[PDB]
Design a protein around this ligand. Structure first.
Ligand SMILES: CC(C)(NC(=O)Nc1ccc(Cl)cc1)c1cccc(C(=N)NO)c1
Ligand SMILES: CC(C)(NC(=O)Nc1ccc(Cl)cc1)c1cccc(C(=N)NO)c1
Ligand SMILES: CC(C)(NC(=O)Nc1ccc(Cl)cc1)c1cccc(C(=N)NO)c1
Ligand SMILES: CC(C)(NC(=O)Nc1ccc(Cl)cc1)c1cccc(C(=N)NO)c1
Ligand SMILES: O=c1[nH]cnc2c1ncn2[C@@H]1O[C@H](COP(=O)(O)O)[C@@H](O)[C@H]1O
Ligand SMILES: O=c1[nH]cnc2c1ncn2[C@@H]1O[C@H](COP(=O)(O)O)[C@@H](O)[C@H]1O
Ligand SMILES: O=c1[nH]cnc2c1ncn2[C@@H]1O[C@H](COP(=O)(O)O)[C@@H](O)[C@H]1O
Ligand SMILES: O=c1[nH]cnc2c1ncn2[C@@H]1O[C@H](COP(=O)(O)O)[C@@H](O)[C@H]1O
Ligand SMILES: [K+]
Ligand SMILES: [K+]
Ligand SMILES: [K+]
Ligand SMILES: [K+]
Lengths: 356, 351, 364, 361
């Protein structure tokens, strides 16, 4: 065969975690983790850098709950600075797991593009905790040059770069000096990249390959995109990602940007790809414009997502994420296994808060 | 370097090969072991769910030769009453104790020794120790406490889905292990937590280990059609536990209701919000009304008899020794169902 | 430690690779063998079902060059009457010039009478005797489970009593079963446990073998005895006929594609301003009212005459043989190379991304 | 036992892996070979179908850098007339179409389909100035095709000749040895095609391209991947596998330029789209049973807007792979095989689409 097929790649729906002997209840497990080599999270969730997901309200709530929000970059420098500053002056025992810097202020992230040094300058002055250098194709000279230039001017600024989906890409970014890599080419709910360009790696195999390489450098992996249910968070972490970035599951909350609207008797919010026409008009598109149901507060969403993670860790018998990653074992399943895993042969009559 | 230990299969992935047969479906024998010490005349058990089994369903299961497990979503006195109703019902296939009284089971959870005490005094035949995660310190310590206090009480524990878990429960002294993490029709465990094992591979793995102890395996959850029962027993389960196929019956708890011109009964997971009243592991639903348990069980056991006839098996143990499987594809599964023809008459065993 | 023999494939899992061809579809030969002793001029048999084959359908199947098998869900006198109607439709001494010009490929016995088959069950020796006396050309011994003592004993009794009667027996799905029936003296084995459109056996009993692998395994054993294999059930499209024959079947038995025709028994009816005929498994409750059912009761769209259906089915086979370069069915089996496909490959193979606005005569 | 040669994959079974890139999508080169002797500025060819390509579609495809193939479901004189219209096709146009695919005289290039043994048709198309003849059969790997290739190359040594369709390495070898200038690969993948269902014959398109490219490269002969392209990503996969150009039917059938009528049905505009082996197409020509259907596709506007989106997807793909040009694309490309769940992850999922996207239906 002329064509080079390197592996058969799996994603979340193709695998399940095996139960393990457990001496710990879900409410007892520890779910803190690392965002970067130098920044910890108290809970492993990050809200996506998207203009229908994270501005200051979402970033504040995510940090209060122990995680992180990344302010999107589809705004001018001054507006983004204003958003970072609003998170940073936000700060109450209602939030005992709040993720704070050494001064007691909430952590926040902010996204940047290739070559946007003036923006990096402004965000550093505004007190940003981590810069997220994002591009459709992180394994690129433009990205690596920007990494090198930022770490040369701000040696102690935590820098996350992405997105990537190969071991070669993880090595290249780790060698350029990043503090974490963000993995995900194509898995996003609103993403058409794989369909429009033919490029991508199914998300489980992409995490697995990139974690194996990035661990050789001590660099955490953020699993970005494709999370549909709380069970997918556990699988992403068990394969070895240090944290998970989520868009669609948070787009429908009070705190995300944009107003509620009603369609056919039910309430929704807009949710769209940053590579969709609408977002780019604020080169051919790699995302769509859509809607997601309204699901209330980020707090109630996060409670269900982490409840599922805790249940998963109790089933596996892990006391914390490190132990979860060391001892998780998987089985590969079939299409019929997946059908068996969902609800089947019964008509759901009541909504469940964690299953749609 | 992720640890995938196995490609795991479930019911729809496999079929039984026919073998040379000298037996007609009429003639095969379908008795089996529930526990090390209790035999069933038919290998079907109704699920311990508050939309499936109270006394009326348990009575009919035992009269037909199997067993009902009274659910534990009720206080102790209520469950004792349900047990006494079944034992008091009477005193050719009926599953009876040494006094001519129907046999019945009853579910308990961890740290419920007072419920065990009352159920034993009420004459329960078997206690079913029921957890979302059987392979845990709480369950193992509860098994050891029950067997130390009641050496001669048959104890079933679950649920599990690995060889290591079957070993642990068998070493602690259970009389049967119940296998099934995630296969249930109303179950969302695998979606909410990412954990589970497709039911065929889980039975296969647990049987191999439990056989070392002479301990039967109960295949719990995921049975959709009667062929699923045949497959589970052929792989080596000694009995099968069924929820959804029995919940739309006259005998299950709860009332008929009508929706869009046709009748239903509620059916819900014991880890759904409704049953527990939180991060649920089940949903609340409805199933079509299908008449009496008698007519359902007749169809289910009819399928099992046909299967044993096709395989040439005189009885369950011979069925397990003779069974050979093929793995099939999605195209093979579509070929197996009805295809390319519009069904006009609802068929008593295929829906 | 559960014993999985193999991964088994059915029609939609495979495709034939094109091969170098020097023949056009109108030039290929499609005659074949029904049994060791009976030839067909085309490779199609209508199912022994009370919604498919009674005398009218059997007369048409024979005129077109194949065979019809009269079902057995009737008393002996009624099945004799059906067989005689086929045997008396035509004869060597009656020069029906119309029928002889329209149907030049008609499949006839040595007296110039249309051939016909008839179904029997285990131990129905009285029915066999009456069918022989009626002039039946081949007896089809049907059971849900051909690989059984009851069937093998029936085969040995029939072959002892009528050594020259061609006898088909089924249904089977393993090589061991084919070996057992061939050693017992059958003239052809009929393969298919579970593939039928109206069949629920695999779902109700968990027992079956996907049809391509089942044919493949039984052909390899039956060929050792010179015994033809009949692929019975699960044919959805003309391409499935080609695949079945290419894998090694000598003929194919079809139910649902022939049930909605003028010639099948049963009356046209209308559902929501559309015409249908009934089509039901012989193991359905309706058919058995005459233990738990192994089929359903259904309807299929009315499609006109058996002639236009068969014309399309054989046109697809001829095309297939042209693509392989096969001059005849045995050449087809010796040339044929398959590929295994995926789910996406099956999607690609069907019509996709286009709304169909006209009925194609061979694609529904 | 039966002989299964391999497990065959098509477009939805595979994805391209990203590679290290120093190039942006607007900088990559998408020039490619049509035959041994003719190049395209862009690798797209409109299908030789009577609902896709007559002179108007061929003019636009050539103006955008590719090619149109005039279908053969018409008499010789009608097909000569369509070819002449393209060849007869002001100085502003040269500004607006700076990538036009022209012959030596500055006329738009055009192809035309012929059938087995149709030497009279070849003679008339050559005198009309056709740039390439596409010898097309349902079954290219046949004595009839092979003898016609030989007779055409004997009589017109300098006429570029594409032959198809094929799906195996043995077939590419036979056509290359008989002297074709490109082979066209595709048995069964077409949107409107029922060949694999009617006859059971075919090879999933990715494996078919891959097998034919390996053999045809030994003769320096380009492969045209014909059929089954649903999205722009499929074009990228086909080229990365080793195809030199891609032939497109359904994605161009609902354009202004395709022949046949815009009509409205239930508030939406469509155009007819049908297989050349459908009953309607063959009754036009007027015996073999059909190997295609008759349908309709939504109206999508101009060919230019469609082509812009398709090539934008190709450029993006080459940027992800790090490829500066098509040959570099093919050398660098590495694939993964995916599952049905992988394909579901790849599409839009768990969100309702509320706005039209120009490259994703
Ligand atoms: C602009 C657009 C539509 N596409 C690209 O920039 N494509 C792209 C860029 C570089 C290379 Cl070498 C190849 C392709 C975009 C915008 C915002 C987000 C994304 C996205 N896919 N994020 O994950 C994409
Ligand atoms: C309560 C709830 C919703 N979940 C759990 O208890 N989860 C759970 C328990 C222990 C551990 Cl270590 C991990 C997870 C439940 C209630 C009833 C039944 C089930 C069920 N999954 N099978 O019966 C679950
Ligand atoms: C009666 C019924 C419903 N089932 C059986 O007779 N079952 C059966 C027979 C023997 C053995 Cl050992 C095992 C199972 C039936 C009637 C007519 C046709 C079929 C059928 N499956 N044909 O392919 C089945
Ligand atoms: C006419 C028809 C329906 N079929 C054939 O000509 N079949 C065919 C020809 C030769 C051989 Cl040896 C085998 C089969 C057709 C018409 C137009 C296009 C096609 C088609 N499949 N193109 O790819 C087919
Ligand atoms: O339009 C785009 N094209 C491709 N990927 C995108 C686009 N916009 C956002 N993303 C990615 O999709 C992720 C969200 O995935 P989700 O959680 O599945 O909704 C984000 O964190 C980005 O990495
Ligand atoms: O809500 C729950 N979550 C997970 N599993 C459940 C829940 N409730 C009942 N089950 C299991 O599902 C089985 C019934 O499955 P069914 O026969 O497929 O409907 C029961 O016997 C239990 O083992
Ligand atoms: O009810 C039944 N159960 C199982 N198989 C049946 C039954 N009735 C007929 N068959 C088989 O199904 C075949 C027809 O399949 P079809 O062509 O796919 O509809 C017949 O030739 C029989 O072998
Ligand atoms: O009716 C037919 N039967 C089979 N293939 C056809 C027929 N008509 C056109 N084709 C092929 O299908 C291709 C178009 O496929 P599409 O781009 O997927 O719509 C054409 O270029 C031909 O190769
Ligand atoms: K489930
Ligand atoms: K079937
Ligand atoms: K097709
Ligand atoms: K996607």
């Amino acid at each position: 065969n002329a064509m080079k097929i390197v592996k058969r790649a799996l994603t979340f729906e193709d695998v399940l975690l095996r139960p393990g002997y457990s001496e710990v209840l879900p409410k007892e497990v520890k779910i803190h983790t690392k965002l970067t080599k130098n920044i910890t999270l108290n809970m492993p969730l990050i809200s996506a850098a998207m203009d229908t997901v994270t501005e200051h309200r979402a970033a504040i709530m995510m940090a209060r709950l122990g995680g992180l929000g990344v302010i999107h970059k589809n705004m001018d420098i001054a507006s983004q600075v204003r958003e970072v500053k609003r998170v940073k002056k936000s700060e109450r025992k209602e939030y005992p797991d709040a993720n704070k810097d050494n001064f007691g202020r909430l952590r926040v992230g902010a996204a940047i593009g290739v070559g946007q040094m003036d923006r990096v300058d402004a965000l550093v002055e505004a007190g940003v905790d981590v810069v997220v250098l994002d591009s459709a194709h992180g394994h690129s000279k433009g990205i690596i040059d920007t990494v090198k230039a930022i770490k040369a001017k701000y040696p102690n600024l935590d820098l996350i770069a992405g997105n990537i989906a190969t071991a070669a890409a993880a090595k290249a970014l780790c060698e350029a000096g990043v503090d974490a890599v963000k993995v995900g080419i194509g898995p996003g709910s609103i993403c058409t990249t794989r369909i429009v360009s033919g490029v991508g790696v199914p998300q489980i195999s992409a995490i697995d390959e990139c974690v194996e390489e990035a661990n050789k450098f001590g660099v955490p992996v953020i699993a970005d995109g494709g999370i549909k249910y709380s069970g997918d968070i556990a699988k992403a972490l068990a394969v070895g990602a240090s944290s998970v970035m989520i868009g669609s599951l948070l787009a429908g909350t009070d705190e995300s940007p944009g107003e509620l609207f009603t369609y056919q008797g039910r309430q929704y919010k807009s949710y769209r790809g940053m590579g969709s026409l609408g977002a780019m008009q604020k080169l051919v598109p790699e995302g769509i414009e859509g809607r997601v149901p309204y699901v209330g507060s980020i707090r109630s969403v996060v409670h269900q997502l982490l409840g599922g993670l805790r249940s998963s860790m109790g089933y596996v018998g892990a006391k914390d994420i490190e132990d979860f990653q060391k001892r998780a074992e998987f089985v590969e399943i079939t299409t019929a296994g997946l059908k068996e895993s969902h609800v089947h042969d019964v008509t759901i009559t009541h909504e469940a808060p964690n299953y749609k």
